[PDB]
């Protein structure tokens, strides 16, 4: 209801790269939990941590926070499975964690589609998993496909149809500028029109003859740094060739 | 199909022989715990003993020599799982070590009798207190060497053990008196050396054995006699006070509840005392003679991490 | 003249510098202004505050033309330390950080374009006080709490440095009953800062002065805990003045005494005498028309004000660090195992 299975096995079968967080260490090692099957928990031994004997002041800084690991051995019925993060390449940080981050963002969408719709999370999860995460890779890149490749929405039955609407609402910023056209001319209107015809094609609003409120959309918030500046430059260019005066805030 | 907890393995062999003592009996039970119950995975093995040691503390809460045995067995299997054998050999690599302490910690006491010879010298009147059996094996070696000395046994009240030691070595053939523990302070001037033995060693060097080893220790420091203490290398526990108050048996050492019908009134005070580093001066290990500052460092050398 | 401790030259009263060869940081003068005119620190408050100005002063690099950044800052920062030496000579909380910092000056190569010079130093010297101070103090909390029962008393001396946070945890974050006895002394009433804080925290605080010290001990009293300034290689506690008189008395009155401390506050040096290695601080302070004036110019008069003093390690029962507890004779074994090793 809060979290559940990923890939229809009770345990992360031998040699699959997983992620855990370290909770506490007393003498055995860490009492980690498997972040793909969150409520289940395994553990790691002290020699399978960092090779240098880790001091207790070095030990305390790493609890709570998470990392990447692989599993050494698996009990078929006990949850007491053996971890391995020492014998893990650095590429699995790129491989597993972004794959897990691609599975963290489907946790963000399947929570309000479950509990704010008041159904348990696993039943509308396990309608998704086998035709998506077993037919091919798991469904978040397919969720950027299923907004345009609609053989997936009909490839499985919808047990509810609120979830079909709540997906495209989520997955599918304004920089304010108060530019002051303080003109005293005769060909200024034309200039203004010209300016409009390049800076808007982002959100440009007339306030009066001098004041204009333009809220330039940014994608990385820092990509509108190259937009606003450009607009300003254009404005500067514009008014020297017509006769008036534009001043920018 | 055993469970190794209370008596289905442990209290069997405590009626076998009163030569094995309490902590290595727990060590004998703990090494045979994972020997038969070897659940082919490093994870739940230590989770089995963490279940098993904590109920063993719960089994007898007031025999904290067992807690020292519960302490260092985890210290055994930790570094034995170290050398990095990925649990593949370390199942066999632990149990090929295995029967170490039933071959090595059983020969603690004779190795104490190997190196504890040159303390009881020519004509030393010896003050002993409580059945710490490593002392008697040192005294067994003293009679077998035919070195000349005498002996004085105190009480062990209420634990009665002083009556045993008088009977235990008079048949061995040593001139000996049993004295009351009340008459220590008027006799200790003639006494030259004094031997006791702890149930466990605390972080500064602790005497966590009996009722009044701290009483006879603080007598000996004003008598300015070398207050020796005899133990061995598996009698260490982290449990460490700041006063002479440990965990008690069940209640505070000054109770004031009343006698209901006929309840025992000598048993109202404590049964375990504490002595810090100040009143001991030397101790014996299987590693050798040990100063009271080195017993702090070796109890911290593999204990911080 | 017979002891001639007035002619023990551990400090003078020299001031009034004017030199401008170095580009002196203005804010590091404020740190020395905040110390010497009226002392506002313990020892780890200095170890914070010495680090507070160091993150700012490295950010203004000002590296010259023909000089590597490894070559100038070993002179540039170290010239500013002598400003502090005019104000107040260093501690080991000063000392162990700065020689560790001089390692970091030396282990850099001529490759940094001075934009990378921030974050390789900034977070690293931040993870110093994150590890060596903050979560080091976190391990103090759980260790001391299990050694304290409810409905008992604590006797502290002066302003504490780390066990203020310990007393906040047991009174509020664990809510077990506790009574607090804070005693400080003329002239530095730094214990009143704790007396403000813990009653602002709402706990039973009994303020005291060291002249009335016996009647505190004549009541229900135990668990004397202490702040610290450094631990000697023997086990002597070099700490604030007047620490040992309760440390002798409470040990004489058979209730145990502990010293809350850390591995950063250890030291390689060793001595066993109180008036050998110390610091004097401006003998005008023990006056407050006054009652007397003229320790100067008058025949046969002097004012001493001892800052630091040793306590015998036999008085201390248990020494608690972030790694755990330890008896006070076993102090220097961490010097070979953790300090410079951990």
UniProtKB/Swiss-Prot annotation, chain A:
PANTHER family: EUKARYOTIC TRANSLATION INITIATION FACTOR 2 SUBUNIT 1 (PTHR10602:SF0). It comes from the Eukaryota. The lineage of its organism: Eukaryota, Fungi, Dikarya, Ascomycota, Saccharomycotina. The gene is SUI2. It comes from Saccharomyces cerevisiae (strain ATCC 204508 / S288c). eIF-2 functions in the early steps of protein synthesis by forming a ternary complex with GTP and initiator tRNA. This complex binds to a 40S ribosomal subunit, followed by mRNA binding to form a 43S pre-initiation complex. Junction of the 60S ribosomal subunit to form the 80S initiation complex is preceded by hydrolysis of the GTP bound to eIF-2 and release of an eIF-2-GDP binary complex. In order for eIF-2 to recycle and catalyze another round of initiation, the GDP bound to eIF-2 must exchange with GTP by way of a reaction catalyzed by eIF2B. Present with 17100 molecules/cell in log phase SD medium. Phosphorylated; phosphorylation on Ser-50 by the GCN2 protein kinase occurs in response to low amino acid, carbon, or purine availability. Phosphorylation inhibits the guanine nucleotide exchange factor activity of the eIF2B complex. It is found in: Cytoplasm, Cytosol. This is Eukaryotic translation initiation factor 2 subunit alpha. Its main location: cytoplasm. One of its GO terms (biological process) is formation of translation preinitiation complex. One of its GO terms (cellular component) is multi-eIF complex.
UniProtKB/Swiss-Prot annotation, chain B:
Its main location: cytoplasm. Disruption phenotype: Inhibits GCN4 derepression in glucose, amino acid, or purine-starved cells. The modification Phosphothreonine is found at residue 291. One of its GO terms (cellular component) is guanyl-nucleotide exchange factor complex. GO terms for biological process: cytoplasmic translational initiation; positive regulation of cellular response to amino acid starvation; positive regulation of cellular response to heat; positive regulation of translational initiation; regulation of translational initiation; translational initiation. The modification N-acetylserine is found at residue 2. InterPro entries: eIF2B_alpha/beta/delta (IPR051501), elF-2B_alpha_N (IPR042528), IF-2B-related (IPR000649), IF_2B-like_C (IPR042529), NagB/RpiA_transferase-like (IPR037171). It is found in: Cytoplasm, Cytosol. GO terms for molecular function: enzyme regulator activity; translation initiation factor activity. Keywords: Acetylation, Activator, Cytoplasm, Initiation factor, Phosphoprotein, Protein biosynthesis, Repressor, Translation regulation. Belongs to the eIF-2B alpha/beta/delta subunits family. Present with 8970 molecules/cell in log phase SD medium. Acts as a component of the translation initiation factor 2B (eIF2B) complex, which catalyzes the exchange of GDP for GTP on the eukaryotic initiation factor 2 (eIF2) complex gamma subunit. Its guanine nucleotide exchange factor activity is repressed when bound to eIF2 complex phosphorylated on the alpha subunit, thereby limiting the amount of methionyl-initiator methionine tRNA available to the ribosome and consequently global translation is repressed. This is Translation initiation factor eIF2B subunit alpha. It comes from Saccharomyces cerevisiae (strain ATCC 204508 / S288c). The lineage of its organism: Eukaryota, Fungi, Dikarya, Ascomycota, Saccharomycotina.
Curated annotation (Swiss-Prot), chain C:
GO terms for biological process: cytoplasmic translational initiation; regulation of translational initiation. Disulfide bonds: none annotated. The keyword Coiled coil does not apply. It comes from the Eukaryota. The keyword ATP-binding does not apply. Keywords: Acetylation, Cytoplasm, Initiation factor, Phosphoprotein, Protein biosynthesis, Repressor, Translation regulation. It is found in: Cytoplasm, Cytosol. GO terms for cellular component: cytosol; eukaryotic translation initiation factor 2B complex; guanyl-nucleotide exchange factor complex. One of its GO terms (molecular function) is translation initiation factor activity. Present with 10300 molecules/cell in log phase SD medium. Belongs to the eIF-2B alpha/beta/delta subunits family. Component of the translation initiation factor 2B (eIF2B) complex which is a heterodecamer of two sets of five different subunits: alpha, beta, gamma, delta and epsilon. Subunits alpha, beta and delta comprise a regulatory subcomplex and subunits epsilon and gamma comprise a catalytic subcomplex. Within the complex, the hexameric regulatory complex resides at the center, with the two heterodimeric catalytic subcomplexes bound on opposite sides. Acts as a component of the translation initiation factor 2B (eIF2B) complex, which catalyzes the exchange of GDP for GTP on the eukaryotic initiation factor 2 (eIF2) complex gamma subunit. Its guanine nucleotide exchange factor activity is repressed when bound to eIF2 complex phosphorylated on the alpha subunit, thereby limiting the amount of methionyl-initiator methionine tRNA available to the ribosome and consequently global translation is repressed. This is Translation initiation factor eIF2B subunit delta. The gene is GCD2.
């Amino acid at each position: 209801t809060s979290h559940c299975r990923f890939y229809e096995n009770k345990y992360p079968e031998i040699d699959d790269i997983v992620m855990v967080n370290v909770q506490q260490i007393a003498e055995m090692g860490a009492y980690v939990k498997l972040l793909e099957y969150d409520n289940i928990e395994g553990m790691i031994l002290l020699s399978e941590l960092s090779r240098r004997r880790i001091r207790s002041i070095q030990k305390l800084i790493r609890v709570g926070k998470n990392d990447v690991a692989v599993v050494l051995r698996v009990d078929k019925e006990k949850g007491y499975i053996d971890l391995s993060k020492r014998r893990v390449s650095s590429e699995d940080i790129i491989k597993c964690e972004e794959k897990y981050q691609k599975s963290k963002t489907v946790h963000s969408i399947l929570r309000y589609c479950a509990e704010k719709f008041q159904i348990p999370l696993e039943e509308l999860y396990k309608t998704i998993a086998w035709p998506l995460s077993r037919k091919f890779g798991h469904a978040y890149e397919a969720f950027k496909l299923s907004i345009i490749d609609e053989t997936v929405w009909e490839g499985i039955e919808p047990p509810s149809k609120d979830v079909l609407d709540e997906l495209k609402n989520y997955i599918s910023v304004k920089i304010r500028a108060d530019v002051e056209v303080s003109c005293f001319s005769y060909e200024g209107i034309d200039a203004i029109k010209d300016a409009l015809k390049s800076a808007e094609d982002v959100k440009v609003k007339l306030v009066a003859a001098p004041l204009y409120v333009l809220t330039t959309q940014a994608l990385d918030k820092q990509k509108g740094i190259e937009q606003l500046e450009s607009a300003i430059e254009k404005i500067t260019e514009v008014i020297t060739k017509y006769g008036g005066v534009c001043n920018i805030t | 199909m055993s469970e190794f907890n209370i008596t289905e393995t442990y209290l069997r062999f405590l009626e076998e022989d009163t030569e094995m003592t309490m902590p290595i009996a727990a060590i004998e039970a703990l090494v045979t715990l994972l020997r038969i119950k070897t659940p082919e995975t490093a994870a739940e093995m230590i989770n089995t003993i963490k279940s098993s040691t904590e109920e063993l503390i719960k089994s007898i809460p007031n025999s904290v020599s067992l807690r020292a045995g519960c302490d260092i067995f985890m210290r055994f299997v930790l570094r034995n799982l170290h050398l990095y054998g990925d649990w593949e050999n370390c199942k066999q690599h632990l149990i090929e070590n295995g029967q170490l302490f039933v071959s090595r910690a059983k020969k603690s006491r004779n190795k104490i009798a190997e190196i504890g010879v040159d303390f009881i010298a020519d004509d030393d009147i010896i003050l002993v207190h409580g059945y710490s059996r490593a002392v008697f094996s040192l005294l067994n070696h003293a009679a077998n060497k035919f070195i000349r000395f005498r002996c004085v046994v105190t009480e062990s009240r209420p634990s009665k053990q002083g009556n045993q030691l008088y009977t235990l070595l008079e048949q061995k053939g040593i001139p000996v008196t049993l004295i009351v523990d009340s008459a220590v302070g008027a006799v200790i001037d003639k006494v030259d050396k004094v031997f006791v033995g702890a149930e466990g060693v605390a972080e500064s060097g602790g005497i966590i054995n009996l009722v009044g080893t701290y009483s006879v220790g603080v007598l000996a420091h004003n008598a300015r006699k070398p207050f020796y203490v005899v133990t061995e290398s598996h009698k260490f526990v982290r449990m460490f006070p700041l006063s002479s108050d440990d965990l008690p048996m069940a209640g505070p050492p000054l109770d004031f509840t009343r006698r209901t019908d006929d309840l025992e009134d000598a048993l109202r005070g404590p049964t375990i005392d504490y002595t810090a580093q100040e009143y001991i001066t030397a101790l014996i290990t299987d590693l050798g003679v040990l100063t009271p500052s080195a017993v702090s460092e070796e109890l911290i050398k593999m204990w911080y991490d | 003249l017979e002891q001639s401790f007035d002619n023990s030259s551990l400090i003078s009263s020299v001031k009034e510098l004017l030199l401008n060869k170095d580009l002196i940081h203005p804010s590091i003068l404020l740190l020395t202004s905040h110390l010497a005119h009226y002392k506002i620190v313990g020892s780890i408050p200095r170890c914070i505050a010495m680090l507070e100005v160091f993150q700012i002063v490295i950010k203004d690099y000002q590296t010259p033309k023909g000089t590597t950044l490894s070559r100038n800052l070993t002179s540039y920062l170290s010239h500013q330390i002598d400003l502090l030496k005019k104000a107040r000579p260093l501690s080991v909380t000063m000392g162990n950080a700065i020689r560790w910092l001089k390692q970091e000056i030396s282990l850099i190569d001529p490759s940094t374009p001075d934009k990378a010079a921030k974050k390789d130093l900034c977070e690293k010297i931040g993870q110093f006080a994150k590890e060596k101070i903050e979560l080091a103090d976190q391990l103090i909390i759980d260790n001391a709490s299990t050694q304290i029962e409810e409905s008992t008393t604590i006797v502290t001396y002066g302003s504490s440095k780390v066990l203020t946070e310990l007393l906040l945890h047991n009174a509020i974050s664990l809510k077990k009953n506790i009574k607090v006895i804070v005693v400080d002394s003329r002239p530095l009433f730094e214990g009143r800062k704790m007396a403000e804080t813990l009653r602002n925290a709402g706990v039973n605080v009994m303020y005291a002065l060291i002249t009335s010290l016996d009647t505190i001990f004549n009541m229900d009293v135990d668990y004397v805990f202490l702040g610290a300034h450094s631990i000697l290689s023997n086990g002597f506690l070099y700490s604030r003045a007047g620490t040992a008189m309760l440390a002798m008395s409470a040990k004489r009155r058979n209730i145990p005494v502990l010293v809350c401390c850390e591995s950063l506050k250890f030291s390689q040096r060793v001595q066993l005498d109180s008036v050998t290695f110390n610091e004097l601080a401006d003998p005008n302070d023990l006056v407050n028309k006054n009652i007397l004036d003229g320790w100067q110019e008058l025949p046969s008069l002097n004012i001493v004000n001892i800052l630091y003093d040793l306590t015998p390690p036999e008085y201390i029962k248990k020494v608690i660090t972030e790694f755990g507890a330890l008896p006070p004779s076993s102090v220097p074994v961490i010097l070979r195992e953790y300090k410079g090793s951990a």
